[PDB]
C-alpha cells in the first residue's frame, strides 16, 4: 500500500567545507506497489526548521516548490541519491535546493542495464511518473507544495525531465504505469528544467549529418568515473569512405523532417531548409550562436574599458570566425566556427548499424539486447536487426506531446555552444516548438561550454523563484 508515513523519518545534518544543513529524510519509500527492480524507490528530504514554522526565502512547509532532479545518464539506471559531494567533487543540487529553501525528492528510476532487461524504454519515464503521481496521491501528508514541482536533469537525464513536462497526462503511458502497480493520479509539473537533454532520438542522426557533414576527423573524451580511481579515454580518429557516404545520405533526410514541423522565429517568420540543408532555420541556429558570443563579448568589453591590457574569459576577442565591429559581433564564418568546435561522433551518431550505441540498448527489450530506431539504420545495419516498435520510440520524445497533453507552463533549457553530444538543431527545436504553442521557454547556449549541467544552479533557483511569483 501506498500510504505515505510522515513519521518514519530521521532527522541528518550535512557539513561540508563548513557549509551546514538540517533536514528530514524519509529514505527508501517504494512509489508503486508492483515494482519489478529494487532501484524504485525515491528520498524525500525537507528543510528541518519548516517544523518550527520558519520560512525560507519566502517558503513555509507547504507552500515550498519541490524540487525533483534525476541522477540518469547515458540512459543508464539512475539511483535515488540525498545530500552532499557529486562525482566531480562539487556540492551537489540536493544540498542546495535544500539549503534554498525547496522540498527534494529525488527518486530511483530504472535503466537498460537493470537486471531479465526491465529497464528498457519507456522504463525511465513510467517510473518518474509513477513517483510524481506517488506524491499526488499523498497531497496531504507529502511536505511542499505538488502544483509546484520542477523536474531537473543532465543529458539523458535533461532528456527526461523534458519528456516529463511534454507528456503531462498521456494515456500512452497507462499500460506500463498499471504493470508496476502505479497509483492512479495525475502526472503533470510546473516546471521543467533541461541541461543538454539527448532526446529526439529517432531523428538527432540526420540533424547530427546535417551538422556535421564534411568534417571526417572526430574527437572524443570520455570519462568513466568510480570511487578512488580514474579511468580516462580518448579517442580521434577520421570518417571512413563508408562514413563519408552514410554521413552525406543522412545528412539529405534532415529538410524533410525539419519543414514538416511548421516552426516560425518570434518574428512569424517560417523555418526552413531546402535540399541541401540551407535557409531561414540555418540563418536562426546561426543567429543563436552570434547571440551566444555576443553576451561572452559583453563580458569582456566592459572588463576591458578598465585595464585594457587585460584577456577574457574564452578570449572571445580573440575568435576568428567572429566578425566583430564596434563591440558588436556582425557575422560569423560557420565554417570556422564548425572547425573549431570539431566533429565528435561518427556516422551515424545514434542508431549504429551494428548497434552498439547506448540509445540502440534503450530501444532493446526483455529479450533483445538491442534494436534499431531510424529506417536509414534498419536498411544500411551491419548486423541481423530489427526495428523498435514506433509506439515505444514515441514514448521517449518530447516534441511529440507538446500541443496535444498537459505540458507544464514553464521551461528553461540550456546547452552549451560548445557540446557536441548532440546537434544544436535538437535544444533549438525544442525551444522552438514550446515557444510556438504559447509555453514560456528560457533558452540559452552559454559561450565556450561542453557537456555538463547544473553550473548555474543559483539562476536556476531564481528561476524557480520568479515564476513561482507569476
Known sequence: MLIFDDKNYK???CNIDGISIKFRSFKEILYCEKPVDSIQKMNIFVPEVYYEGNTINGYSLHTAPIFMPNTVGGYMPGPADEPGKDFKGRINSIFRALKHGYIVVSAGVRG?????????????????????????????????????????????????????????????????????????????????????????????????????????????????????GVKNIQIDGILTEKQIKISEELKRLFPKYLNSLKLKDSSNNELLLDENGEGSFKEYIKKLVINSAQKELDLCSTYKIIDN??????????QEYLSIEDEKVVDINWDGFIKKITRMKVAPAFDALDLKSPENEEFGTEAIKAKHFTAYSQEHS?????????????????????????????????????????????????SLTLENNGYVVDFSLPWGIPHSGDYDLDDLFAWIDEIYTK
Not at 403 to 413: G, P
Open 11 to 13: 532527522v541528518d545534518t
Open 112 to 228: 537498460r542495464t537493470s537486471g531479465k532487461m526491465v529497464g528498457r524504454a519507456p522504463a525511465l519515464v513510467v517510473d518518474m511518473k509513477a513517483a510524481i503521481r506517488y506524491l499526488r496521491y499523498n497531497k496531504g501528508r507529502i511536505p511542499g507544495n505538488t502544483e509546484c514541482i520542477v523536474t531537473n536533469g543532465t543529458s539523458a537525464g535533461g532528456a527526461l525531465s523534458a519528456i516529463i513536462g511534454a507528456s503531462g497526462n498521456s494515456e500512452d503511458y497507462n499500460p506500463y504505469l498499471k504493470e508496476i502497480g502505479a497509483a492512479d493520479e495525475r502526472d503533470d509539473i510546473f516546471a521543467a528544467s533541461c541541461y543538454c537533454p539527448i532526446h529526439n532520438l529517432e531523428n538527432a542522426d540526420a540533424a547530427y549529418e546535417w551538422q556535421f557533414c564534411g568534417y571526417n576527423d572526430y574527437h572524443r573524451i570520455k570519462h568513466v568515473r568510480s570511487e578512488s
Open 382 to 430: 551491419e548486423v541481423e536487426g530489427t526495428l523498435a516498435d514506433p509506439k515505444i520510440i514515441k514514448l521517449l520524445n518530447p516534441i511529440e506531446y507538446i500541443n496535444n497533453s498537459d505540458t507544464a507552463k514553464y521551461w528553461r533549457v540550456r546547452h552549451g555552444a560548445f557540446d557536441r553530444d548532440i546537434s544544436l538543431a535538437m535544444p533549438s527545436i525544442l
Open 309 to 318: 591590457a587585460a584577456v577574457c574569459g574564452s578570449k572571445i576577442d580573440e
